[PDB]
C-alpha cells in the first residue's frame, strides 16, 4: 500500500526510488503524465518557489538602493508592476527565457532518458559530492515547503496589503 495513504494502493508510476516519493498520488496524475516530466516540473516549481519565498522575506527585511526610489516603496506584486513599468522585470524575463530555452532542451533529454529530472550538473562548490540522495531529499522537502510558504505569503499579501514579516508583526 501507499506509505502516506495507508488505505490506498501504491501508485504504479511511483516506484519509490525518486527523492520525496512516499506514494502520495491519490488522484493518479502520474498515471496520466510522464513521471519524468512531472519530476522536472516539481523540481522547477520547488526551486522557483524557494527563491520567491526567500526573496519575499529578504525584500521585507531589506531593499536595494534605487529600487526603492523606482518602486515608490511598493511591495510584492505591486513592486512587480512598478518595475515592469520601469523595465527591470523585462530584463529578468529575458534572461530567464534565455535559460529556459536550454531548459527545454534539457527537458527533452530527460524525456529521452539521458538526463535525470532536474539535474543541470550545477554544483560549483561541490556540496553534492558526499550524499547526493540526502541533499536531493532535502532540496525536494524544502521546495515543497517553500511552495506552500510562497502561496501563504502571496495570499496574505492579497488579504492585507502587508508582506510576510510585516503581517506577522501586525496581523
Amino acid at each position: 500500500m501507499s506509505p502516506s495513504i495507508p488505505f490506498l494502493k501504491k501508485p504504479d508510476a511511483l516506484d519509490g526510488t525518486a527523492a520525496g516519493d512516499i506514494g502520495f498520488d491519490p488522484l493518479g496524475f502520474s498515471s496520466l503524465a510522464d513521471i519524468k516530466f512531472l519530476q522536472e516540473a516539481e523540481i522547477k516549481h520547488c526551486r522557483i518557489a524557494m527563491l520567491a519565498a526567500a526573496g519575499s522575506i529578504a525584500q521585507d527585511i531589506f531593499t536595494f538602493p534605487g529600487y526603492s526610489a523606482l518602486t515608490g516603496g511598493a511591495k510584492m506584486t505591486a513592486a512587480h508592476d512598478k518595475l515592469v513599468a520601469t523595465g527591470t522585470m523585462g530584463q529578468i524575463l529575458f534572461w530567464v527565457s534565455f535559460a529556459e530555452v536550454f531548459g527545454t532542451v534539457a527537458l527533452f533529454d530527460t524525456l529521452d532518458g539521458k538526463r535525470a529530472p532536474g539535474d543541470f550538473k550545477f554544483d560549483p562548490l561541490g556540496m553534492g559530492k558526499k550524499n547526493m540522495a540526502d541533499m536531493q531529499l532535502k532540496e525536494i522537502k524544502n521546495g515543497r515547503l517553500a511552495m506552500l510558504g510562497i502561496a501563504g505569503m502571496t495570499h496574505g499579501y492579497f488579504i492585507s496589503g502587508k508582506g510576510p514579516l510585516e503581517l506577522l508583526g501586525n496581523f
Binding site: 498515471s31 496520466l32 503524465a33 510522464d34
Partner: protein, 180 residues
C-alpha cells in the same frame, strides 16, 4: 435481446457494445442505416465542440481579452461585438483544420477509406496521454460522457440565455422566472 438503456425496446443490432458509452441506446435505429463509425465521429466532434463551447461561455464571462470589442459578459452579444474579421479568420482556420486533420478525406464516401482511420481518431495526442492501454479505455469513456454532458449543457445555456437575456452565472445569481 433487449437494450440496457431502454429495457422494453430490443437491443440495436449494429451496436455491439465495443464502442465506449454503448448502453444500447438507439430507439430510432439510426445505426441501422448510418454507419456507426460515421455516427461516432460526428458524436465525438459535437461533444468536443460543445465541451469547448461550455468552457468558453463560462470563462469569457469572467475573463476577457483586452479591448471594448472583447469586453462582453453576454455570450450572444460577444458573438456580434467581437471583430468580424477575426470571426471570419476563425472560420477559415476551422476549415483548414478540418481539411488537414482529416487528411483530405472529409466526405461520407472517403472519410474512412484507410482501414487505419478509426472513428474520432484524428491523430491528436500532443502530450501522448493516450498511449497507456490501461487508462485508454477509461479516457475514451470519459471523453464520450463529457461530450454528451457538454452538448446538453451548451444547448441549455444557449436557450436559457435566449430567454433570460443575461449570462449563465449572472442568471443563476440573479434569477428571474420567465414572464411572457
Amino acid at each position: 435481446e433487449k437494450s440496457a438503456s431502454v429495457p422494453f425496446l430490443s437491443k440495436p443490432e449494429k451496436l455491439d457494445g465495443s464502442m465506449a458509452g454503448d448502453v444500447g441506446f438507439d430507439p430510432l435505429g439510426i445505426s441501422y442505416f448510418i454507419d456507426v463509425k460515421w455516427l461516432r465521429e460526428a458524436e465525438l466532434k459535437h461533444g468536443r465542440i460543445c465541451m469547448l463551447a461550455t468552457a468558453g461561455i463560462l470563462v469569457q464571462e469572467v475573463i476577457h481579452l483586452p479591448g471594448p470589442a472583447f469586453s462582453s459578459k453576454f455570450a450572444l452579444d460577444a458573438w456580434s461585438t467581437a471583430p468580424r474579421g477575426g470571426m471570419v479568420q476563425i472560420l477559415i482556420a476551422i476549415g483548414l483544420i478540418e481539411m488537414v486533420s482529416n487528411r483530405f478525406a472529409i466526405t461520407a464516401t472517403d472519410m474512412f477509406a484507410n482501414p487505419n482511420r478509426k472513428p474520432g481518431d484524428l491523430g491528436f495526442d500532443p502530450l501522448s496521454l493516450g498511449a497507456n492501454p490501461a487508462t485508454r479505455a477509461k479516457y475514451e469513456l470519459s471523453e464520450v460522457i463529457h461530450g454528451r454532458a457538454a452538448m446538453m449543457g451548451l444547448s441549455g445555456m444557449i436557450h436559457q440565455m435566449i430567454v433570460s437575456k443575461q449570462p449563465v452565472i449572472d442568471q443563476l445569481l440573479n434569477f428571474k422566472p420567465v414572464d411572457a
